[PDB]
Write an enzyme that holds these catalytic residues in place. Structure first.
Site, PDB file in Angstrom:
ATOM      1  CB  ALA D  11      -0.857   0.000   1.204  1.00 50.93           C
ATOM      2  CB  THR D 140       6.051  -5.623   5.173  1.00 50.77           C
ATOM      3  OG1 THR D 140       5.604  -4.587   4.300  1.00 50.77           O
ATOM      4  CG2 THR D 140       5.903  -6.846   4.281  1.00 50.77           C
ATOM      5  CD  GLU D 178      -5.896  -5.564   6.782  1.00 51.00           C
ATOM      6  OE1 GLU D 178      -4.749  -6.079   6.878  1.00 51.00           O
ATOM      7  OE2 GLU D 178      -6.502  -5.490   5.680  1.00 51.00           O
ATOM      8  CG  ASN D 201      -7.959   2.103   1.721  1.00 47.03           C
ATOM      9  OD1 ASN D 201      -7.896   1.071   1.035  1.00 47.03           O
ATOM     10  ND2 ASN D 201      -7.042   3.074   1.651  1.00 47.03           N
ATOM     11  CD  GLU D 249       5.943  27.933   9.957  1.00 42.20           C
ATOM     12  OE1 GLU D 249       5.247  27.932   8.905  1.00 42.20           O
ATOM     13  OE2 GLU D 249       7.215  27.954   9.967  1.00 42.20           O
TER      14      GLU D 249
HETATM   15  N1  LIG Z   1      -5.119   3.281   0.138  1.00 44.54           N
HETATM   16  C1  LIG Z   1      -4.574   2.145  -0.267  1.00 44.54           C
HETATM   17  N2  LIG Z   1      -4.588   1.059   0.560  1.00 44.54           N
HETATM   18  C2  LIG Z   1      -4.031  -0.110   0.159  1.00 44.54           C
HETATM   19  C3  LIG Z   1      -3.435  -0.269  -1.061  1.00 44.54           C
HETATM   20  N3  LIG Z   1      -2.970  -1.535  -1.154  1.00 44.54           N
HETATM   21  C4  LIG Z   1      -3.267  -2.188  -0.012  1.00 44.54           C
HETATM   22  N4  LIG Z   1      -3.926  -1.296   0.787  1.00 44.54           N
HETATM   23  C5  LIG Z   1      -4.468  -1.444   2.128  1.00 44.54           C
HETATM   24  O1  LIG Z   1      -3.396  -1.713   3.010  1.00 44.54           O
HETATM   25  C6  LIG Z   1      -3.727  -2.824   3.787  1.00 44.54           C
HETATM   26  C7  LIG Z   1      -2.938  -3.975   3.218  1.00 44.54           C
HETATM   27  O2  LIG Z   1      -1.593  -3.634   3.329  1.00 44.54           O
HETATM   28  P1  LIG Z   1      -0.566  -4.609   2.595  1.00 44.54           P
HETATM   29  O3  LIG Z   1       0.362  -3.792   1.704  1.00 44.54           O
HETATM   30  O4  LIG Z   1      -1.355  -5.569   1.777  1.00 44.54           O
HETATM   31  O5  LIG Z   1       0.350  -5.328   3.728  1.00 44.54           O
HETATM   32  P2  LIG Z   1       1.942  -5.557   3.604  1.00 44.54           P
HETATM   33  O6  LIG Z   1       2.352  -6.895   4.221  1.00 44.54           O
HETATM   34  O7  LIG Z   1       2.656  -4.417   4.152  1.00 44.54           O
HETATM   35  O8  LIG Z   1       2.297  -5.644   2.066  1.00 44.54           O
HETATM   36  P3  LIG Z   1       2.441  -7.155   1.602  1.00 44.54           P
HETATM   37  O9  LIG Z   1       3.812  -7.700   1.982  1.00 44.54           O
HETATM   38  O10 LIG Z   1       2.247  -7.160   0.142  1.00 44.54           O
HETATM   39  O11 LIG Z   1       1.408  -8.011   2.363  1.00 44.54           O
HETATM   40  C8  LIG Z   1      -5.214  -3.074   3.609  1.00 44.54           C
HETATM   41  O12 LIG Z   1      -5.867  -2.301   4.584  1.00 44.54           O
HETATM   42  C9  LIG Z   1      -5.528  -2.540   2.232  1.00 44.54           C
HETATM   43  O13 LIG Z   1      -6.871  -2.084   2.102  1.00 44.54           O
HETATM   44  C10 LIG Z   1      -3.415   0.820  -1.899  1.00 44.54           C
HETATM   45  O14 LIG Z   1      -2.887   0.699  -2.993  1.00 44.54           O
HETATM   46  N5  LIG Z   1      -3.983   2.022  -1.507  1.00 44.54           N
HETATM   47 MG   LIG Z   2       1.763  -8.537   3.898  1.00 42.78          MG
END
Ligand SMILES: Nc1nc2c(ncn2[C@@H]2O[C@H](COP(=O)(O)OP(=O)(O)OP(=O)(O)O)[C@@H](O)[C@H]2O)c(=O)[nH]1
Ligand SMILES: [Mg+2]
Ligand SMILES: CC[C@]1(O)C[C@@H]2CN(CCc3c([nH]c4ccccc34)[C@@](C(=O)OC)(c3cc4c(cc3OC)N(C)[C@H]3[C@@](O)(C(=O)OC)[C@H](OC(C)=O)[C@]5(CC)C=CCN6CC[C@]43[C@@H]65)C2)C1
Ligand SMILES: Nc1nc2c(ncn2[C@@H]2O[C@H](COP(=O)(O)OP(=O)(O)OP(=O)(O)O)[C@@H](O)[C@H]2O)c(=O)[nH]1
Ligand SMILES: COc1cc2c(c(OC)c1OC)-c1ccc(OC)c(=O)cc1[C@@H](NC(=O)CS)CC2
Ligand SMILES: Nc1nc2c(ncn2[C@@H]2O[C@H](COP(=O)(O)OP(=O)(O)O)[C@@H](O)[C@H]2O)c(=O)[nH]1
Ligand SMILES: Nc1nc2c(ncn2[C@@H]2O[C@H](COP(=O)(O)OP(=O)(O)O)[C@@H](O)[C@H]2O)c(=O)[nH]1
Ligand SMILES: [Mg+2]
EC number: 3.6.5.-
Lengths: 427, 124, 419, 427, 419
Positions: D11, D140, D178, D201, D249
């Site tokens: 994300a 992550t 989550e 989101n 600020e």
């Molecule tokens: N706003 C936004 N939210 C996202 C996006 N992609 C995933 N998310 C949100 O971020 C959360 C998922 O995060 P992830 O990136 O899938 O978790 P991560 O482990 O850090 O990344 P991965 O290693 O791919 O699993 C969920 O709440 C999704 O709705 C995006 O492109 N935009």
């Molecule tokens: Mg992940």
């Protein structure tokens, strides 16, 4: 025999500057120094050309003393008789008397002695100073104490410039004046007060100058001074010596402060008008409008009157004009004193500054009178003071240089006493 | 008033004289005190060397805020470094010996294949 | 006799750069070059603001202090930028703050010395140093914080000499910045202890002068700074000009301040924007014309000082002046006698044929302080954005301890509506 | 001075990608690297490091624990935008649990990142802070982020951290687990982060349905809209500005208290392609329907408001826009922050992606507000959590990577506290 | 990121060989040859099932295990028989069994190694092994017995990676045998300990699914395997396809399984035999359509996952989906919030323009287990055919010990109809 001038402090100096100028015009000394005993009274015939005053000038800023070693008369004094202090007085007795004064005081005192060293039988000192004002009260006072020590008998004659609201004072003036005049009173012999109000007032009534300068004022004070000294730099009976001063004007050790009155102040351009009568000039003398400390002595009482006429004047008149001054006025001589009148005529015609505002005259009177009403000035200071000190007003700036809170108390306490002594001379 | 005037002195450049008009009818500056000028001098060095050794007060209180900060920081850095790393040897010790609490519970239903097949080479 | 100028912090620096190019052009000075003006006087007391160097040239005794580049190079590259002595620019580099503590402790004390080493090199150079005058903001940090410190570090190194400041007490209008009350209150405290006089330029007034009485819709810092610049030339005039008085500035202080607690003057002006004499005074003594946000009506004048400008008869001035303290007779304390004095210099400002300026020690200035301690205690109430300072090394109680000093000042002013 | 971007986690990265794109369209950097914009031999310098004698490279680093997404960058144009190093990728995935990224699988890469970000802040005289973009829930995104930030806090003492969290919502598909992830990180991460721009989101998706009229809004759909909010928050220090203002600020204004406070994000005019009044756009901001975290602040109280206008605006207008956004609207400003409503104008027009869904506008508002009702999000997470953890729901997968049962407790324990702090700011 | 496929035992092999030739032709793969299909996507995640070798060519990561020739040379000589790597066929030779123990101890352990030495080869070859998935029967021996062992010997060698199985849970209608309950119960035990998720393909459902609903009189192993092959394509889709999610399969596990006791999914399908969206869901969530013989009614859903196939608007799906968990609102546990998630891949299966598949952790799966321990305790009752294992080297009590573990599983499920 000899007669040193000390002018401390901006006012004192500026006054001094424009009455040495008048002494010079009277005795005929072209600025450089040379003239084409008698008037030895005031001048020390230095080297084989020049005439150098018996003067010393001290001020705690340069600036003013600087204008002397710049404008002609620049060759009149000895370089060393002009002492200057770099850091200002800052407009409070406290500074000059203790903080900033201490520093220069030993220099002056030395130099005045250098001057009285070439003097077989020096008489006294004329001291010209400001009543309110920084060094003027402060330093003066200190000078005068130490003078009293270094020169035992030798009379001191002060010419104070008592200050007034318009010709610009300073809030803190009142303090300064009460302050000095305390310490300075037991150390000084006779004191010609000069009310700045009075002078400015005369320049408006008589000279018709809407906005009178210092340089405007000074000129008129320049004359009063010349006329009081006159008698001793010419030698022409009466006040021919310093003893003979308080000998005639104050009967009371309490330094008494004689009233100054000048005769015909008339504006040139009214020059070639008529020469005023021997009678009439006298008649002005006994006029509030022509005084020199804003007061009135048709409310107080007289304790010694002295008329100083200068010029072409025969006694016959003076007498027979006084006659009718007594017949047509408010005599009011107090209880236990003849009805004074020690009259001196000095045959020397009264010279006035050439680009000056007044005109050459025929004859001028002078009038030195010790009145109990001269203490109406004494009181007007005191009120201003009382009412500030009620709240410690500015006190702190002085406690700040390092004075006592009670030196303010123990000085008011004196004015209260003197204000009472004067009033206690009543019938 | 009609005068009566007695003349004193008759100089060369002048005349003086008394004129009574109506008979009157009735009947130490000491040097020592300049020690009062170094009486200021030593009340004014107080005044100052006070509100000077009093601005030397606020002075190394600067040494203080400029310290209680820097010292405040190394208390956070060199505190939550082992508030991290000592929760991460805490972690290793927890799995690194749980992936092995999985292994020994296996190598047991394993050393049991052998000790009941070395029992099938004894049976029927 | 001779004064050095410290000018620190974004606001400070702006103000001072306008100050400079006003006065410089009054005395007749080029970007660098020296005299060009068919007057003569000017040079008399040019001494007081202008230590001179190589050949002709005239360079202002000025120390430019700030904790970040930009706003200096704003001057360097602009009005009279070529004027100031190049190693007289003390850069910050670092974060600035908008936060007293940063400037008065951590990021500030980092510099101080290097500024102090240059003030030393101007003052120690001076023939006879009269004192320092400094310009800065009271809200926000690198001016208010480093400033209050420079001065705290200047006294101590010169107890001797007197402290002068122009301090711009900041407002809710003309800037948001949730914290200034804090910075202001933290300085006002500092100010009351280590300066001898301070002119309070209230930004709040400045605004109103541009909008209540001016029609200036989009008010710059620019026009509005143009107001200060003018007020400052006026306040200073008879140090840097004539031979009317001479004005030790110590003299100015020992005459204006009855009470050690450095009483802050609210200044005032005559004509404005970017004149008869009666119509000049009645305007210079109007509240709607004060440089500090008060109404010198709720509260009296302790001492007043007015200085006029242009070839006009002071016959009419003494008379107009005594006439204000008559149709307003009650609002001049009567325990201090002639507590309003006037001076006349006849060399006009910018455009402007007539003009006057006004310095006023007025207990009504209390109304100002109260109103900063007003939004202060409203914040420090429930210890607001305080953790911005806590973390930079400050104590909780240094705020109460300042809040409480300031509250006193208010209640000593409130006291001197006595009898 | 300088301002590094860290985008961790799918994300975070994908958001990052489509707002570096926006930065590039705003400053005029053709993917190729170079800008026909005259030099760079500052200002446009805050975010870019003028590398070599042609190119402009971001001050960015991208970490994620799978390649895949990071891979999309080094594949699609802008492929030439970054340095090859600033893109770090982890091979083995995060598996959707904090436990993994913070301990097990993170340990491994963490040292790499930490190194490379330092390489980047090495060519930076006076680096300011960090922007960290990450997911709230997500493998992550919660886990690694948290770790990163602890260690950042150590390696960079002062330097502020600015997090942009993507708070998660049921539909734009979450994951069962989550809730855990979010409660977990936000705990650890909170005492190490300075200010945090939450982005719900739900909100975004919601805005893409009401306003854009997209029935099935993509990430690529969402990201675009977030791309803008970010641009407008950074903006201030990105372009120069003059007639207005940096964060720092705006930062002092938003966060009155230790607790990292999480400002609300609101965007101004989102209008679908295929000019609104200065007044009106503002009026949009004070609307639930246009917010960045589903909730409402006509129920909470305000503790600081910030309005960020961009484009064809004049203050004379904002003045009345605001004043009226009070005269008859949802007022509520709390017991002790007299201010709130800081306001700057970043004249530079609000440049939108070319094949994007939104249109070029004239002027856009941005509104950054710290409200106590932002804690209505805080709670809605907590409940989901409370009620799973009630049964140890999925706990084990975390105890399995090697966490403590009580690190779940000791973190809930914080949310309960924070959920209380927020509510305790009430009148 | 990459997975290997073990496929052992007559039934296992059958299923897998249908699995393979379904997906192979979805990605577009020849008997050997590589790509032929005007689509493009396919090859994105082809990685996950297809370690590739010489030149073009594409070969499935697949290990074929069995304890007797025939059924391998049934594949080798038939559908996509030329596909699997030749020394990837691990022959038995010996007796098979139709008896767990033979496969899990005597005739099995005989081989295991030789299999394990090739799983090692594919896994140690893989760029980043995600985990293994395995196919086999639960009743009968060489799949159920050797399998349970392969895995027990796979974990230990990779505790690291996760375990995935399709296990065909058998019944009295449609059997090779009497003894299976025994074999089933002996595995179910093994499964619950060493896998992370298992898909329960109940042959009983499959049968009922071809006679209650499919016109087919006596179902072969053919039309019938046919169903599994379709369901398995369904389950896997978003590991092997798009860029919707990404599906670590670990992610799939840590999201589907609340409780470590590896809970068994009952799968489901949309259209069948050898479609409106509303008419798709209401069907995919119908018991009469579950791949395991239950009625997800007597018992609730722990977590659900549904994955749709074909160019249809997901506007309608989110909406249908939330609508099932409303007209059935009570049967989704309310202690695990959003415990039903959906995904959409738009590349159709065999024929079939629309389609869906369904994965369900349902406590109703208890009904299955109970019914195999039902005929178990009815047999082990009076120690029936037990002397078939006794003699191969097993203990009497290893049955009770398994019977009792299984009984527990039933009663934990029965517990999680909680509150
Ligand atoms: N706003 C936004 N939210 C996202 C996006 N992609 C995933 N998310 C949100 O971020 C959360 C998922 O995060 P992830 O990136 O899938 O978790 P991560 O482990 O850090 O990344 P991965 O290693 O791919 O699993 C969920 O709440 C999704 O709705 C995006 O492109 N935009
Ligand atoms: Mg992940
Ligand atoms: C002289 C420096 C200055 O220009 C002074 C003001 C603030 N800024 C400049 C720019 C500016 C202004 N307004 C802006 C709006 C958006 C972006 C920028 C601005 C400025 C102006 O209008 O010049 C034309 C201005 C600003 C304000 C302003 C007036 C103003 O110009 C008249 N108000 C005085 C304050 C204000 O907060 C206040 O104190 O109310 C009592 C005021 O509140 C109201 C309702 O007036 C208001 C007006 C919109 C409201 C919210 C934000 N605050 C900040 C300060 C205040 C404003 C001018 C610095
Ligand atoms: N008559 C007259 N009075 C003066 C003159 N100059 C100043 N004064 C008055 O003297 C008082 C101020 O005294 P100053 O001489 O100025 O003070 P000072 O300490 O002696 O001099 P400074 O050290 O410069 O302050 C005020 O009352 C003035 O009105 C002058 O030239 N003539
Ligand atoms: C094999 O690939 C799959 C992988 C996963 C999921 C899944 O079911 C739809 C799969 O298909 C069979 C998945 C599952 C279930 C969840 O629990 C209900 C969840 O929240 C979430 C998911 C998947 N993610 C999402 O739905 C968020 S977009 C991630 C793991
Ligand atoms: N009039 C004047 N005041 C200013 C100016 N700039 C800022 N101010 C005011 O002073 C405060 C902070 O000044 P600033 O210089 O930015 O603080 P610094 O960080 O100390 O430099 C603001 O709240 C304003 O009210 C200036 O241009 N002129
Ligand atoms: N549906 C499906 N099930 C099968 C198939 N072959 C066998 N089975 C079932 O699996 C069980 C035994 O399988 P079997 O392979 O003979 O045992 P093995 O010797 O271990 O391979 C029986 O209960 C059958 O019903 C198959 O072709 N498809
Ligand atoms: Mg003086």
């Amino acid at each position: 025999r000899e007669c040193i001038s000390i002018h401390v402090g901006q006012a004192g100096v500026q006054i001094g500057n424009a009455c040495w100028e008048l002494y010079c015009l009277e005795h005929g000394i072209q600025p450089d120094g040379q003239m084409p005993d008698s008037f030895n009274t005031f001048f020390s015939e230095t080297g084989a050309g020049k005439h150098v005053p018996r003067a010393v000038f001290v001020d705690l800023e340069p600036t003013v003393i600087d204008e002397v070693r710049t404008g002609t008369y620049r060759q009149l004094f000895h370089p060393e008789q002009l002492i200057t202090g770099k850091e200002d007085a800052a407009n409070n007795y406290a500074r000059g008397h203790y903080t900033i004064g201490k520093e220069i005081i030993d220099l002056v005192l030395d130099r005045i002695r250098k001057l009285a060293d070439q003097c077989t039988g020096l008489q006294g000192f004329l001291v010209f100073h400001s009543f309110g004002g920084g060094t003027g009260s402060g330093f003066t006072s200190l000078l005068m104490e130490r003078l009293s020590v270094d020169y035992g008998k030798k009379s001191k004659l002060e010419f104070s410039i008592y200050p007034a609201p318009q010709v610009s004072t300073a809030v803190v003036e009142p303090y300064n004046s009460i302050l000095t005049t305390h310490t300075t009173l037991e150390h000084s012999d006779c004191a010609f007060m000069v009310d700045n109000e009075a002078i400015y007032d005369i320049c408006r009534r008589n000279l018709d100058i809407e906005r009178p300068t210092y340089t405007n004022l000074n000129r008129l004070i320049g004359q009063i001074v010349s006329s009081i000294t006159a008698s001793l730099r010419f030698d022409g009976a009466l006040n021919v010596d310093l003893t003979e001063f308080q000998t005639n004007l104050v009967p009371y050790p309490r330094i008494h402060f004689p009233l100054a009155t000048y005769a015909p102040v008339i504006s040139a351009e009214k020059a070639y008008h008529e020469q005023l009568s021997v009678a009439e000039i006298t008649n002005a003398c006994f006029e509030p409008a022509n005084q020199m400390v804003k007061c009135d002595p048709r409310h107080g009482k007289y304790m010694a009157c002295c008329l100083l006429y200068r010029g072409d004047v025969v006694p016959k008149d003076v007498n027979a004009a006084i006659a009718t001054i007594k017949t047509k006025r408010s005599i009011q001589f107090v209880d236990w004193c003849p009805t004074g009148f020690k009259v001196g005529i000095n045959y020397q015609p009264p010279t006035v500054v050439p680009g000056g505002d007044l005109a050459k005259v025929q004859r001028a009177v002078c009038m030195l009178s010790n009145t109990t009403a001269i203490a109406e000035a004494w009181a007007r200071l005191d009120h201003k003071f009382d009412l500030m000190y009620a709240k410690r007003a500015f006190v702190h700036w002085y406690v700040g240089e390092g004075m006592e809170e009670g030196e303010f108390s123990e000085a008011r306490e004196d004015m209260a006493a003197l204000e009472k002594d004067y009033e206690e001379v009543g019938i | 008033a009609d005068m009566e005037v007695i003349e004193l002195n008759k100089c060369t450049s002048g005349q003086s004289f008394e004129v009574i008009l109506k008979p009157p009818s009735f009947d130490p500056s000491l040097e020592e005190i300049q020690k009062k000028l170094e009486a200021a001098e030593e009340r004014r060095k107080y005044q100052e060397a006070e509100l000077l050794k009093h601005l030397a007060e606020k002075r190394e209180h600067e040494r203080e805020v400029i310290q209680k900060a820097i010292e405040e920081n190394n208390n956070f850095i060199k505190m939550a470094k082992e508030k991290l790393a000592q929760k991460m040897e805490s972690n290793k010790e927890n799995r690194e010996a749980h992936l092995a609490a999985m292994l020994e519970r296996l190598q047991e239903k394993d050393k049991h294949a052998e000790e009941v097949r070395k029992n099938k080479e004894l049976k029927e | 006799r001779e004064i050095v100028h410290i000018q620190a912090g974004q606001c400070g620096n702006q103000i001072g750069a306008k100050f400079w190019e006003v006065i410089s052009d009054e005395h007749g000075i080029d970007p660098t070059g020296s005299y060009h003006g068919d007057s003569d006087l000017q040079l008399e007391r040019i001494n007081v603001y202008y230590n001179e160097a190589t050949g002709n040239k005239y360079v202002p005794r000025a120390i430019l202090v700030d904790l970040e580049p930009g706003t200096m190079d704003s001057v360097r590259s602009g009005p009279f930028g070529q004027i100031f002595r190049p190693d007289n620019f003390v850069f910050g580099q670092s974060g600035a703050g908008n936060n007293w503590a940063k400037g008065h402790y951590t990021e500030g004390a980092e510099l101080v010395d290097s500024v102090l080493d240059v003030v030393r090199k101007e003052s120690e150079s001076c023939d006879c140093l009269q004192g320092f005058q400094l310009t800065h903001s009271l809200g926000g940090g690198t001016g208010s914080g480093m400033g209050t410190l420079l001065i705290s570090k200047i006294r101590e190194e010169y107890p001797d000499r007197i402290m002068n400041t122009f301090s711009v007490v900041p407002s809710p209008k003309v800037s948001d910045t949730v914290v200034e009350p804090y910075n202001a209150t933290l300085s006002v405290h500092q100010l009351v202890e280590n300066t001898d006089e301070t002119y309070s330029i209230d930004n709040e007034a400045l605004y109103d002068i541009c909008f209540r009485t001016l029609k200036l819709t989009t008010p710059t810092y620019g026009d509005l700074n143009h107001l200060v610049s003018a007020t400052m030339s006026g306040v200073t005039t008879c140090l840097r000009f004539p031979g009317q008085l001479n004005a030790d500035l110590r003299k100015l202080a020992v005459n204006m301040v009855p009470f050690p607690r450095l009483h802050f003057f609210m200044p005032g002006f005559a004509p404005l924007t970017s004149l008869t004499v009666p119509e000049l005074t009645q305007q210079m003594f109007d509240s709607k014309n004060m440089m500090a946000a008060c109404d010198p009506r709720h509260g009296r004048y302790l001492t007043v000082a007015a200085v006029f400008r242009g070839r006009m008869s002071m016959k009419e001035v003494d008379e107009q002046m005594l006439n204000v303290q008559n149709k307003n007779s009650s609002y001049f304390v009567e325990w201090i006698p002639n507590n309003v004095k006037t001076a006349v210099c006849d060399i006009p400002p910018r455009g402007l044929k007539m003009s006057a300026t006004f310095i006023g020690n007025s207990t009504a200035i209390q109304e100002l302080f109260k109103r900063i301690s007003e939004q202060f205690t409203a914040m420090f109430r429930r210890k607001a954005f305080l953790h911005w300072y806590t973390g930079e090394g400050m104590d909780e109680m240094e705020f109460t301890e300042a809040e409480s000093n300031m509250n006193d000042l208010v209640s000593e002013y409130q006291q001197y509506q006595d009898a």
